[model samples]
Structure formats: structure tokens, C-alpha cells
Target chain A: MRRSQRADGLAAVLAIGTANPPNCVTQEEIPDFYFRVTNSDHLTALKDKFKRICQEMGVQRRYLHHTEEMLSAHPEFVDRDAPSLDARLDIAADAVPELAAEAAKKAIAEWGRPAADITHLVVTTNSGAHVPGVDFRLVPLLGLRPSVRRTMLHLNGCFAGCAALRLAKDLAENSRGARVLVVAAELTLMYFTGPDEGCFRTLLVQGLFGDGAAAVIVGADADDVERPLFEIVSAAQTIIPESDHALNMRFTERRLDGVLGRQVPGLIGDNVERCLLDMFGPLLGWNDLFWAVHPGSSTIMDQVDAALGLEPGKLAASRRVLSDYGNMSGATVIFALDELRRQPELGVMMAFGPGMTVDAMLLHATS
Target chain B: SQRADGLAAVLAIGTANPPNCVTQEEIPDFYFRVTNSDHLTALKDKFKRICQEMGVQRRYLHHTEEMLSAHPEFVDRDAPSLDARLDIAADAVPELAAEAAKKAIAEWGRPAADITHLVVTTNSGAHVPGVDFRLVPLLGLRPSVRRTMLHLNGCFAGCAALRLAKDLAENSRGARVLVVAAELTLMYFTGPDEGCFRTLLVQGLFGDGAAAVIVGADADDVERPLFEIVSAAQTIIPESDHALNMRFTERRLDGVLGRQVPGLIGDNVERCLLDMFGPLLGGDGGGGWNDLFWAVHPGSSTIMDQVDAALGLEPGKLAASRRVLSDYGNMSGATVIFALDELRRQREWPELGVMMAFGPGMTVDAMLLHAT
Candidate 1:
């Protein structure tokens, strides 16, 4: 049975905005600027290795609001045994919201909708979050009404934006005239510790991540958006069994760590086809959708492309996002859509997180 | 206009806690020993009065009773690093949550693969892959099961979980959402801060527990569902978010529940309740208050007292809530489920039940549960 398009009503993607912190460094400049404080064997070899990894990472440059300069000021962060959780968290408390609000302001501005009209808001973060949380600070900063319903997803890892969009879609569909503002940002810089060859995994995680935030405005119906970006046809997510340890964004004794197993790309690749098919359920095929894949890593992007067997330019948008912003984790896929905005065709947005799992959504262009 | 039919049905509920716990009588002594200081002797009596007034006799703890008795240093303020706490929670949270979920799934007799959705709520700890990711294989749930995780929303989070469960259940037919709320509150415990009484209050108030609710579009999945969810709504007051200083900050996971919180709940819960039930009551002008069963969050004696008076609740109306507090203290998100469980065992038959709770954002979340 084919369900009617308007059966449960529709949530239209109205607008999206992204923001970065003050300090921006080119891919080549990263190792020299960031590797300022490094503890590793063969320092010169390590710097050369870092350069190759950053270039291969596909990130042109990154905006790190909380830079090495700020971190070096707090010497404890540099001292291995010293406790820097307090300082990192303090910096995040101030920086995370400012980054989030910047994107929200741009999104709200582009949306051309009354801030007070937003009936619900969803904020996701894995940075140093404090209560009277980002949601509390954002409520006033965004000028959302006092009665606005809020849902916060903390420590959701890289794919948190998909989860936020899923919740926003539900809220918009159920409540009449509901407009939801969804925001995702992470200060991966606070925990960067300037990557070194001492831990190859640390270098990979740090080089791939930079500070970035994205905001999206969702309305209950297609008509609610004056210029609709796309209609959400379907959204689905699943966990890969027994792969819990494959990837981890955990808080270690010293600081937060994005632990990843080399096997993660293969784990994700194995599940992509089945997960995508489950969403469309015999209704669509690989050729039927545009891709907004999360650029979690260069390996992930390559694996997804090879798994789906797309034409060379089919994933141009996603590859471009990886080449430019690296992977903002949860917020990276939104940047993919920004690049895809010009195409505006049948779309499939996907992201991978700690579950060694995947989240995918089907989209249709109204224009 | 829509009638009384709700978005979903609550098929079964199951709850679990850690083995280590403190009796209300023993808790006072445990705190004094941990804060052993000659200067804090007068404060001990004050702590005793607060504990006595807490209306709790027993509550679960994250540490072993032997540890509580022999190792006062374990409760030392700022003793455990964030890593240590996460390590404890990594083992403990999944165990408690999985235990409760298994019981709920077993009671309902639904194969794990049949569950189409999973919603897990927690404030205890935040980790990648999350508790739900670990739970998927632990319970044999299908890999494609959709998940909605609600985190750091605070005590009232269970109600928020139910609201989301109701949404998913209503959104699709055959959607069986396994909703789990687990909090290892003791894992984040900071030993007594000398001047801050809320620190002592939190130590006495919080406990470790996890609760599971199996909600489905159809009630026939089980012999009988404990309650049919009629409506669930979330509301936030303009100025109330300022009253509570409770936040899960990076440096410290410490916060205070201001004196104004009780008043905040009283002021908002009535409007929140009416907005939801007004349509259900239908032309009676909020006439059904007298018979509505209550399962309010037992945050503290003062908050409960204020709610009881503000809502004009009848005597013995809040027996389950009081009993939950007395028996288990506030298990944060899991406490309301504990109260509902108590009500299920004692209540005679089908009745109109209402569950209300308050927490971060000073948010009031309310739900109407119809037992038939």
C-alpha cells in the first residue's frame, strides 16, 4: 500500500546555516600551527606524517574557535598528569553556545520566519555541556518563545544531527503549525591535544575534526516554508549488532576521546545496503536518490561510494564537504546538503556514528 | 475534533536497581563518616533532620554497602575522575537497563525482533554508541529498529520518554517501542560541600535504578496492558528555567535545586495538566480532577507537599508517590515508573491515571494513563 504524501502531514526543510570559530587554518598550516605542543618519537617524521594525513583527509582548512593559543594559556592542559577537564569544560560552556547561536541566527534569518513561531527546538552536542544547558542559553539567544518545547541530545556522537532531524520531523508532523529549529555543534578542538605520532589514532581523530556548527529550520507542512528545500519522504536508523566497541566518543580520565577501530569502515560498509533498502522498502533504488553522506573519514566516504556503485560525480557534494570542512561529525552532512542545494532532486542523506551503524533519510524536491 | 483514543498503549513495565543500597537510618551515619570533620559535627544533626524529613527508608547506591561502611574515602568529594565514573557507568548502566528491558519484554512475550522502535533516556552518563547501541544485541532486537535517545533532560525525562514513545507508536502501525530510562545518579556524587546544603540534599535524594516500558500500537500483544496512554504533553514556563542551578557541566557535575523549584512546579503543572486533559474531559470545564489518580515525581517532601495542595489532591491520592520515595528515594527518571508500579499493585480496577514530573529547564511534563 502506498501511503499518501500528506497522511501524517509533512515536515519541510526550510533553511540551513553553518558557522565556524574565529581561527581558521589551511590544511598545510595545521601541522605547523597545531603540532606546536607535541610529545612523540621522531618529531620531524611525525610532522611530515601529519601533513600527508591532513592532505589525504580531504579537508582544505578548518575553523578552530578554541585554538592551541587558548589551550596553551591553560598550562595544565599541556601537562600530561594535570587535570584540564575543568578548563576545557569552562571554555566549551562559553564557546559551544556562541558557535551554535551563530548558525541559528543565520538559519533563522534565511528562514524569514518569526523566531517566536518556532514551537520546538532540538540541540545536540558531545562537547563539554553544562545544565541550564545549551538549550537554556539558546532559548533566549534565538528569541524562541518561552513556551517552546525543547529536546536536548547530548553525547550522541557523530550522527546526532540525523537523530535531531528525526525528532524535529516528528514534532512538526504532530503539532499543527509547528516550526522546529534543530542545531548541532561540537568543540572537537578542546580535546584535540594537537595530534602526534605517539598515538596514530589520536592524530587521525584530531586532524579530521575541527570546530563547526549547523542549524536547520523545519516546518510542519510544505506550505509552512515559503521556499521549501525538500520534502522528507522517509527517515530510518539502525544499530549494528555486536559492533558497540568499534567506535567510541568517550570521556577518558584526561579528556574526551574519539576512539575508532580500523575495522569501522568495513563494519559500516557491510550494513549500508540493507539499511538503505529498509528505508525505501521496495519503493526506490540506489539510482533514485541524491546522496548527503557524512564525511566521517576519507575511508568512510570511499567505502560508501564503492558499496553503492555510484557514478564518479554522483557524490560530488559529499566529497566537496569532506575536502573543505573535513568532518564536523554530526553537523557535516548538513554541509553536504548545502552543496546539494543546487541539484534539489531525489535525495538520500546518511551519517555514521559510534554504533558502527548508519542513519539514512529519503528526500524529494518540490521545485 | 479528536476523541479520547490515545496515540498508543503501554503494554508492560519493568524496573531494576543495583545491589548496593543505603537504608534511611544508615545513610545519615554514612554521610557523617564521609564528611568526618570536628567542625562539621553540628552539620551532622542538620543532615539527620533533612534525611528524616526525606520520607525515604531505603535507596539504591552505585557503591557497595561494604564500601559505604568501610571506605569513607570512596565518597570523598571530587575523588573519582570523569573517566572513573564513566568506567563504572559503562558496566552498571547497561546491566540495569538491560535487566529492566528484558523483564518488560518477557512480560509482554513479544519477540525482540518485533520491536520497531527503541527510545532510551538517561542523564547518568554520555558515551558514544550509547546505551541503546549496546542494548540492540543484548536483547536480540532487530538491527533496523529505529532509535530516539533523550539525554540530560533531567528527572522529568521519563515523562518526556513516554511522550516520544507515544509519538513513534502513533506514527506507524505495529510500532512497538521499548522505552528505557536508567540513571546511575550515585555515579556522579560529589561528597559533601561544606556550605552548599543542596550537595547534601542530592546525596540523600538520588539513587541508581532503571525502568522499562513496552509501548505498542495494539494492547493485544500482552494479556493486558497496565495502562493505555491517553495523552502526553510537555510545557516550559517563561521564568522557571532560572530557579534551578542544576546542570551537568564539564568541570563538575554538581547543581542545586533552588527553594523556588517547588513553587515553580505548583505554578505550571496545573496549566500543563489542563491543556492536555481539557479536550479529554469534553465540555465539563475540568470536572474530572477529583477521580484522577496521581503518580507525581517525589522530588522532595516540600515539592510533593506543594503539588498536593496546589492540585487539590485528596488524601491518600499520592500514596504511591510517597511510598516510592520512602522505599527507593528519587531515582531521577525512574522514580515515576516506580510509583506507577506501586499504583498498579494496589489499585482495584481501571481508573483515570495521571503522571507528572519536573526537572531541568524547570520543565513540567504530564501524561494521562487510562487503565481499563
Candidate 2:
């Protein structure tokens, strides 16, 4: 009846790091930049509509990998009839790993440990579609050992960052000395497109998403040099029934395609309280704990705040990340974590994505 | 006990494949005819020889002649066929996975709702609300079942899933993890070309199938333990990064299988196995390699042969693996589970076993298993 050796304590967040592409563009300049790049300035009404969407999108300044020059070189990227996925994926194959490595290096530096000590790598990205994926590319890039066990979660949508962390908790706790480097990198260029009146979702998505990567070093037993920011108490995921179609994404020949349903915010609002209570126990009050929720959109933040009846500034970390970086999909939640660690001792991290899935984790912040 | 004190064990296994079956002999003609490449006599001959050497007698595919006819873009290697391929896989992958999972659940003597964790891996589809999510509704699993979706993990994904399942199962009391690996080669379906011989190798070696395994710790009286997961570990072979690579491109699921892949795996597999099992077996594989049952990913005939020679394995040690490959070809990640299922059906069950799979990272994912 001998079980595998396990760590004595719960898995904790040892260090956090985030990176964004250099092409920063403010909200005021996005509509103009988008239209000019897509060669759609001729459509005045649509341009105005896009401008209005950008103004309301809640993101202040966002970073993008695809620049005006880059878009200009690949006209097929903006053409609905043209096949552009190969080019987009090819670009991401190089960029996603490099960006992820940048964030991982920051995390490793902060952790004060040799990269060789990392025992596991959990990588999640909605950007690339390659085997020997971002996880494999990271080993050489980050100087990780060849024996590092890796798990790659691809196209898992926005909730994937927390999803990766959830798996890391199990991996770190199950193996006594396992140090898991969990990374989620995303590039919005995977789904970028011209603003067409017929496809309003394109304009909305184009206005909101940005390119970024986030990495967290997780392990159960922290040494003297290692600082535990937050101890992961428990992790759980659930689906809100009948909401599968509310949010979905799929890779298409032209681009990454799918709808961000209008009902997404409302669905999260209706179900967040129950899901939270179910995960943390009915006796616990939502307002007592600090919050780190995926700021998928301004509306999603608003819905969660209103649903939980949180005081003002409760979601300040999430809002700050959303404003500064826009929604980086799976990578956004970890960015929120990096911001939030700078909390009530008891905290909660949550992320929403396709399948109308909810990934929640309880955390105990450590001094 | 709140958490199981014992190692996780495979309680049940089930495998399923598509109905559109084609023998290896018929594939050359079928592949050439469907792609409108019949005029390339030399290329067809090469493909025929490749098929002959693959050790696959027959394979079931989701892509039928009629299905290919309906989607002409699939056969045109230059055309943007990823969308079509993924569209087909998004539906077919989950349904096939559901079929195999239901069989596993039935054999496990448990309700589908009892499953606490779902780990699904596939190289077939690329979509949010992936095969893992779709399985919830298809198999009527509880919405709260923790789901982990691994996409495009290549051939070793089945072992990868099982490795993760070990932790998930052992960490939580009474946790039942349903690990499923499903692959439809339709993602890489393409025409033969003089310029791309890798495509011929790919098209000839892979088949479409799904395998599901139910893993759990602290088996109750109702649950039967098939194989106890003694340990699981993974290692990457140095300087072999490009030996096998696959990616989704605009045209198809593009891949390159270097000729040295089997040799690289053979050269390093013994060291890898010894590193994992040597300490446990007392020293340097105390009883020798043949003492353990083997359920290896039959990626190809040559890969299996290389391992057999390197490990000095007995003739029948890889019988289950070769049988599965002959019956179903390499279903990528699903092939290892099929081999495991085949191994359990044999009359003589060795007390010890090892399951290993090789994949794109030039990675070896291995697990040490013990029969009850």
C-alpha cells in the first residue's frame, strides 16, 4: 500500500512574470490604425462603428505582434477568401515560444533558482498549433533540462492559464521536489481580420484582444531563497449547463474563428456566485476574499463585480491588467495574478472561457 | 483514508475505430485514385512499398472515398484543407472517443457520472471546448468532472495522459480518471507528390481510432485492477528535436518524420528504461528486459524492431503491440492504449509491465505497471 512520495504542504505560487509584444497602440489610435492596415478606410460608417467599439472596449493601451508593416506584407491575412492560417501559425510558432521564454526567464530570475531545477513544464496557448509545441521550444530557450516532463494544452481558450496552474498543483504536490513552470502565451493575430459590417464580431475582437505571455513557477516546498506568494489551496472546474455555444473558438482556414457570444457576460453573472460557493464552501463569504478574475472584457468584470456585490477597487488588479494589456486570452489570468500578489490572506482566482467553463482556485497569500 | 495510500491502477480499458476499413494492399490504389494521382506510376509503386513495410495489414479510417469526394480540397495538397479537416475531426473525434469511453465505463461497472476527472488527448482537432468538453455531454459525465484537454501531442500523448491521470487519481480520494486518446489521420490526409515523401510515410502509417482507459486508486470491491501504475516518467533525447515534427498549417497537418527517428529512439531507450526501473528492480534491470510485459507504441515496424533488438526482448514480448499495429496501424496517441487493451486479453499476465511511447519532442513517455 505504498503510495508515491508527495510534498508535505499545498502547492504555492513561487514567482510570477508577464511579457507583452512591443507594438503598443493606444485605444485612440486603434480604429484609425486598424482601418488603414485593413485598407478599409473607404468604409466610413464601419470605421466609425469600430471607433465606437474601441472607445468602449475598456483597454487603454494594448500590445500587438502584427504591425501595419507586417499586415501590409501579408494581404491574405485581411482577405476573408484567402488562406492565411499557415502564415499566422508559422509566425506564432516562432513568436509564441520566444515571448513565453521571455516571461519564463523573468519568473526563473525572480525565483532565484537554476532553470535546471524545473521538473515540469505546463504550457497553454491558443496561438500555435505545433506538436513539440511551445513546451518543447521552451526547454532550449529557457535552459531547462532535457528530462523536464512537459504537458501542452492547446486551444483551451481563456480559462487555460488557470487550467495550467490547476494541473501544476497536482504535479507539484504529487512529487516532493517537483517545480512546475506554468506558461500561457497568446497572440491575437491568430484571429485578426478586417472590420466588416457583416462580421461585427471581428471588429469587437480586433478592438479587445492583445498579444502577451505569463509564466508562474509553482511548487509545494519553497526553500529559503524561494518566496511563496500564494499557496494554492484547491482547484476546481465546472461547466454552466446549456451555455456551451455561448463562447467558442476554432481554427479556420482563413483565421482562428468562433463567436464570443453576447450572453457570455450575463451567463457568468448568473452563475459566478453559485460556482464560487460550491468550490469554497457555502459558509464562506465572497467579499471576505481577495479576487483575481480573468478580465475577458469590461462587461465580464462588471458582471462578476455586480454578481458578487464586491466593493469598489476589489477587482482593481484585474481591471488594471485588462486596461494595460487588453484580453490576452489564457495568458491574462496569470497577469492578473502577478498584479494581485502585490491581498487578503485568503484569495480566489477565476477564469472563464469556451464551453462556458469556469476554472476556480482558492489561494492563501503568504508573507 | 481521505486520499488513497496506494498507487493508481488501470481499472478498465476499451478501444474503438472507424467503420470505413481498408487493407494495406488496397490503400495504394485508393490513395492514388482519390487524389487523382493515378498517372504517377513510380510514386504509387513507392507508396505501395511503403505500405508493405508499415506492418499494417488493415486500418479503419474516418475518411472514406465518398467523404473525400465530397471534400475535394482534402486531396489537393496545395489547397487550404485544415479547416475542412478540423471540421470533420471536431465532430468525429469526440464521438469516437465517446464510443470507446462508454465501453470502458461499462466494463468498469460504474456509472459515467461517477467519473471525477476527464483527461483527453488528441492530435486530430484544434478547437476550444475541445474533445474533452464535448465528451461531457456525449457520455453524460458530470459537469464538475475536472477536464484536461491535450491537443496535437503526437504519438506519446496517450502515455502523457496516463501519467497525468496517475497524479489526479492518487491525489484525490476515490477519484476516477477517464483517459481517452483519439486520432483521425484525416487531419494529415493529402495527395502523393514526388517532392514530399514524408507525406507518403504519414499517409501509409496512420489510421483512425480511439482508446479509453479508466484509472483510479483505492479500488473498492466493485473495481477490478488490471495494472497498477508503479511509476511514470518522461525524458527527451538530446539533439533529436527535429527527428519527428508535426504542425497544423493552412494546407494540412504537416509533419516530418526523419529516417533516424527509430534509430535515435533505439539508441537511447535502454538508458531511459534503466534510469527509471533500475533502482526499483534492485540494480541494472535485475531480471532482464524480457521479464516485463511490454505495451509499446507501435509507431512503425522498424521502431518496434529497433526496441526489440536494443532491449533484447523475447519474440512475444511485443506481440500485442505488433497485433494492434497490424490491425489498426498507428493511431498516434491511441495506439498505446490499444496495445494495453490487447495485453490484458492475453491468457498469461506477467507480474510486471512497461508501457512506453515515442513522440515529436524525440520524447519518451514511460510508465511502470504491475498486475494485481
Candidate 3:
């Protein structure tokens, strides 16, 4: 019987890499810079509102691809009624892959393997919308083999980093000798717009979201030269019941538009424990495991911390990544994972997205 | 190796198309009339000829005359109609995919809840908690059903999804995967223009359709296997990245189909097939290409012709692919699944077959299929 061979053990994280754009703006400076660039300084009241939003977002600094000059040049981007998707997508099509390659290169360098050794590529990004997608672009940029199998997950929202990692586990464990390069990159530029009182979600998103890319090398049965950091023991995903409207996003002619519902934090807090219990079971206490949750916002972090009754510092990595890079959407969870790798033997990596979905993976650190 | 005892097989297949149908002969008049481009006589004639030679007999479209009349901006070449297109697709893509998935589940004689994983592919919509998430309620799938959404992978997406399914199905015991690919040409609908001839080709050769397949290994006694997935592999034609390109634009989905794509596939198809099936055909050299039944994506008449000439396939070898194209035009990624369904409906069956598709990345995705 002719059939594909499966690997012998669970998939493990071999390496991780994270990168951000060159344009870094401190939270202190963003309110001034953003208001000045969009010519919205006249709305001093709204500017102060934005300043308060930025200060409390848990982000100290953020890397963005859009500069003041860039925003000035694209007047249509500031005009809510103007159709600017093509320009935004064009910028993303070029930037997402290049940023992804930088992270992938670092991962490969740490992986101690040639780029051609990568057998599978799984890429996720909320920023890109193209056919020969970011996954296809990474091939030539990263010097991957022509025959490398690819799967592109576009517009998968914040949980996409964990989503990509979940699929990587399957790809790695199911195929012998397969090394899957999983990458998630996000550019808030897709949703960048001038602040408007009518759209409070824009202020929330603009304050929270940042630009970054994260890459991880996942495989099974590491060789003598390879070192495995965390073994992906199991993966599961669950949608919070009747919470679909809590977080939503879609591409429009103007930009990527969506609502960040106020109930998101409460909903996650209420259901997160149940989702975790469904996976890891009640045998282990929540504090028994290390955590790598997507730091969606300071509020989300607090809600999860309070919900699970976690001891302090359990979410330090998640909070640190959020503080350092804002929320890079899909790429944030990977940054959290990278921070944690530098672990309790047992841990859970979780992320939340638009379905009000929670993607959780049971992880065991390997020495 | 910790894997299922059996190879992943296609347990059931189902396909769907919109209610509206237009014959190839009438599309030019209908298209030009709807877009108000009849004054461009030269372009109209050019479109007519292109449609005639595209090897399609009729096509099903999601958009109708009334719908087009209401959304006049859709036909305005310079208008930003993508948001409207996607808004329509956001509702239609999942609904259509659910229709196909339900039929496949019905054919499998299993409850929708039995599905363990869902893989959804589309070039139609761009939304978070996308079509894959939407399918849960539509199909009554379990909340925990592992879902993978492939958005905008172009024409090879179906094959790519199935390839991933093969691994997903085989790795986990008792895992049943529902793989669906749905497309709506409304995403790229636009008027004819001399400046851009590719739009004409796009409109002339594409249609709206969705296909779903139930895939799993070690099937239960109630299940019947249509085709066992022997192996799947993908290869890129070096330096052919620009051969076929597509991206979301402000107006609509824009693309360029290079004239060289057909030739590129023709030249590299044989080598890719050999690389995938070489070991299986060992020593004796087997019967070569003609020995296999084929279910190639009917990307276009020219692409079908190229593969036919390159492999020297016998007259009826690609009949299923041709018949699907003739009946439904090129439904992009969904076309190959329709071809597979068509092949299985034939009275005779081949022990071994090949399934292939082409798309952006200038990539060739092929799979070796073995009849149960």
C-alpha cells in the first residue's frame, strides 16, 4: 500500500523570530504626530481623547510603516469617503512580505538550517490581499525551494498566529522530515485612517494595533544539531457562544473597517476558563501552566488575568510584548511565545479573534 | 509512524452553482449590454471571439440583469466597486459553500456533526472570522471543528486545500475533513476596455461555482470511497511568477493572465507528474501518461489543449475536465473538484488517476489518485 509516512513525535518549536518596521513612534508622541498628520489638530478635544486612549492602551511604543509624510501624500487615506483600498493594499503587498522575510531569515539563522530545508510554508496576515500572496512572495525572498508546499491564511484576524501554528503542528507531525515555516505579519496601515468621533473603534484600533511580523520554525524529531523549545502537545479552538458580533472586521473601498465591541473583554473573561477546561481539563490548575496569550489590549490582559485567577507575572511575556509593540494582531501571539521561550514545562498558548473565537494549544517545554 | 491504517480517500463529492445561466454565445451580447459597452464594436467582437474559443458552452453567474442594474457601479471600469462586490460575496460565498457541503455530507450518509475539520478556500471575500467561521452555523458543524481558511490563493486553492486535507485526515484517527472551494466572478466584474484585454478574458472564461469533498481515512462500513489520495505534491515553474498575477484593487479584483501560462504548464507538467509518481511506477516504466485517468483544472481551453498536447493524452482522457469546462466554464479552484465529480460519474473507472491545477505563483498542484 502506497501512503505518506507520518512523523514519530509531536511537533515542536525549533526557533522563533520577530521583527517590526523602522518607523517607531512612542505612545507619548503618537497623539501629537497623528493629529498633526491628519490635520485634525483643530479638534483639540478629540485629540485629548486620543491621547488618553493611547496612554491607557498598554503600548509604550509602536512600529508603523506609515509616516507623517506618507500619510500627507495620500490625502485620500485621510478622507473617509475616498476609495483608497487599492493604494493601501499595494503598500501592504510590498511591505508585508519584506517584513516577513526579515523575521523568517532570523528564524532560519537560529534554526541552523538552510532556507531550502524548509519543506512547508504557512503564512497568515490581516494586512495583505493578493493572489500570489505573502506566502508566495516569501519563497523567492527567503530562498526557499521551488517545490515547497504553501498555505496562505489572509485576513484571519488576531488569532491567526496561533491558527497558523496549529496547522503547522498537523503539517509537521503528519509528514516525515517536514519543517514548516509558519509566519504571521500585520500592518495596521490597512486600517489606518484619520481619527473620527463617529468611529470610536478607529481610535481604539489605531492606538492598540502596530506593524510587525513573527516567524517560527516547527518540526518533529529534531536532529543532533537542532534544539526544540516547546512541544505542541495538542491544539483546540472554540467560539464564545453568541459572541460573533463582539469583534468584526472587513475590507471596504475606503479601508479595513470593523468594530471592536465593548463587550469583547467581558466575553473573553467569562468564557476563557471554560475553553481552557475543555482542552487541558480541570486536573491541572490554571496557574500550573505558563501562558502565551495574545495581548489584545491592557483591558484584555486584565480580564484574562482576573478570569483565570492567575498569579502575578503569569502573563508577563504577553504584557511585555504588548507594552513594547502594541498589538500587532496576528503577529502578537508569536512575539509573546518568543518572550516566553526565553518556560514552565507545561504551558498554554492562546489567542482570540473575530468569531469571538479562542484558539488554545497545549504546550510542553523541552530542555 | 503514528498514522491511520488506511490512505486518505475522497468519501463523497458535491458541487453547486448559481441559478442564473448564460450560454457562451449569448454572454458577449449580454455582457456588453449590461455594461453599456456595445458601442465599442471592436471590443465586443473581440470578446465574442474570445468566448467562442474559450471551450465553454454555458456558465452560471451569481449576478443577474436586475442585480447588475441595481449595482451599476459594478460595470464602471473606473468605479470603486470592490466593497460592494465583497459585501455581496460575504453573504453568497458561505451560503453557496454550505449548499455544497450539505450535499456532500448528505451523500456521505453522515451527520454534519461528524465533521471534525473544515477547510474553506475562496477568492471572493475578505473578512475576519471569514467564510470558515461562517460555515459553522450554516452547516451545523461542531463549534470545535478545526477550521482553516485559504483566502485569495487563486486557482490552485482547491488542490492546495485537498492536499492539506490529505495530511489532516491521515494524521488523526477517525478524522473527517470537509474541504470546500467557492468562487464568485462578481469579484472581478467590469466593462470591456481596449486598454485592458485581460478583463475580457476574465469575464469570458470564469463562472460562479463551489465544490465540496468529504475526505478521511479508515472509513466506516457505511462510507464509500470514490478516490484514494495516493500522493500530492506541488512545484513552481522557475521565473514564472509574473505569468499569472491577481490582487485586490480599489475597483475590483484585477489580474493579468500571461500568454505563456499554458505553454509553461505544458512544458513542466510531465516532469512534475514523473517526480510525484516515479517511484510508484518503478522499473517496469508502466504505461506512461496514458495509463492514468485525469482530472485537470479546466483553467481555459488553451490550458486544456496545452496539457493534452504535452502529454499526448488520448482523445477521451480529459473528457471530464472538458465537460466541466463546457458546462460551467472555469470556476477557478472549484473547477477541479467538479472535474473529479464528473470523472467519478462515468460508468467505467480507472484504478489510478491524476488531479492537477494551475494558478498564480505560476505553481502546479497535482495529486495521484487511486480508485478503491
Taken over the whole model, the C-alpha lDDT of each candidate is: 0.75, 0.89, 0.89
Q: TM-score of A-chain in each prediction?
A: 0.92, 0.98, 0.98
- The CAPRI category of model 3 is medium
Error of 1 at A162 (Å): 1.3
Instruction: List runs of model 3 lying over 4 Å from the truth.
Output: A282-284, B1-3, B281-286
What ranges in model 1 sit over 4 Å off?
Answer: A1-8, A37-42, A194-197, A278-281, A343-345, B1-6, B34-40, B65-73, B221-223, B240-242, B247-252, B271-288, B348-353
- The sequence of per-residue lDDT tens digits that candidate 1 reaches over residues A137-189 is 78878788766677777778778888888777766766567788999998875
DockQ of 3: 0.73
Reference-based TM-score of each model:
0.92, 0.97, 0.98
TM-score of chain B of each: 0.91, 0.97, 0.97
What is model 2's DockQ versus the real complex?
0.74
Ten residues in a row with the worst lDDT in model 2 chain B?
Answer: B278-287
Candidate 1 residue-wise lDDT, B135-163, digit = tens: 88788888888887766678888888888
lDDT of 2: 0.89
Tens-digit per-residue lDDT, B1-372, candidate 2:
145667999999988999999999989988898889889999998999999987889999998888988999888878888877888888999999999999999999999989999999998888888999999989999888899999989989999999999999987888999999999988888887796699898888889999999999999999998999998988888888788898888888887899899899889999988775567654334548877899999988898999999999888999999999999999999999999999888744468789999998888899999888
